[PDB]
Amino acid sequence: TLVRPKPELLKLLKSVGAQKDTYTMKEVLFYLGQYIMTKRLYDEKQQHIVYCSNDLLGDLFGVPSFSVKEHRKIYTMIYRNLVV
Amino acid sequence: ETLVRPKPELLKLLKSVGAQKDTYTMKEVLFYLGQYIMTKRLYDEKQQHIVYCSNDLLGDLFGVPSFSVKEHRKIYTMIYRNLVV
Numbered sequence: 001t002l003v004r005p006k007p008e009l010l011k012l013l014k015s016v017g018a019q020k021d022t023y024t025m026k027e028v029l030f031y032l033g034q035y036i037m038t039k040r041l042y043d044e045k046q047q048h049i050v051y052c053s054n055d056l057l058g059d060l061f062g063v064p065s066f067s068v069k070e071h072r073k074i075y076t077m078i079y080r081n082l083v084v
Numbered sequence: 085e086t087l088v089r090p091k092p093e094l095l096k097l098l099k100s101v102g103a104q105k106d107t108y109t110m111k112e113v114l115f116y117l118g119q120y121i122m123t124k125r126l127y128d129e130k131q132q133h134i135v136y137c138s139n140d141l142l143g144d145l146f147g148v149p150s151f152s153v154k155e156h157r158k159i160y161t162m163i164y165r166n167l168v169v
């Protein structure tokens with residue numbers, strides 16, 4: 001069930017080492033983790049919350065923060081980057 | 085920088101999530117622990133700092149069921165038992 005990240009996103013994934021154009025969600029989210037892990041964008045105290053104003057990622061979601069817990073919306077933000 | 089020398093145990097593991105050197109810093113090994121814990125999803129969905137290694141090569145090499153990434157000193161203890169240095 002593969003996909004394609006609008007120019008920006010794709011340069012995001014590829015910052016953390018994708019090399020394709022086509023990804024299942026489950027496969028893409030993996031790469032997001034990379035971006036958030038290598039970039040300590042999670043909060044250290046609230047360890048499920050992510051913190052993005054300042055970051056490229058911030059833009060892509062138009063939030064400056066969010067929590068991975070809630071899927072209902074974590075997808076939204078990602079569609080909004082897929083040529084989907 | 086200050087490299088450190090890991091046991092035969094550990095090392096296997098790192099090697100599973102990429103790593104190469106038979107020589108690594110602190111900030112280097114927590115890097116791969118980091119990756120392992122991530123890929124083999126071992127933290128808790130609700131409790132994100134808490135990490136269940138019950139069952140897994142990691143826990144059998146930290147000798148524990150679980151543990152908090154909060155306790156700072158405390159992760160250090162465990163880390164050591166896996167260093168021939």
Ligand SMILES: Cc1c(Cl)ccc2c(/C=C3\NC(=O)N(Cc4ccc(F)c(F)c4)C3=O)c[nH]c12
Nearest residue numbers: 033036037042047048068114115117118153159
């Ligand atoms: C939300 C979210 C996403 Cl999406 C992706 C990654 C994380 C995440 C990652 C880490 N938290 C942390 O403390 N470390 C350091 C670390 C490494 C090895 C250890 F063994 C260890 F105890 C501690 C991490 O790598 C915390 N929240 C996240």
Ligand SMILES: Cc1c(Cl)ccc2c(/C=C3\NC(=O)N(Cc4ccc(F)c(F)c4)C3=O)c[nH]c12
Nearest residue numbers: 029032033068074117118121122127132133153
């Ligand atoms: C302590 C610790 C260590 Cl050591 C290693 C990994 C983690 C970690 C990993 C994740 N937390 C999370 O919620 N996801 C799913 C996820 C991924 C990308 C997204 F963009 C996203 F919105 C949701 C994760 O992959 C959370 N704490 C950790």
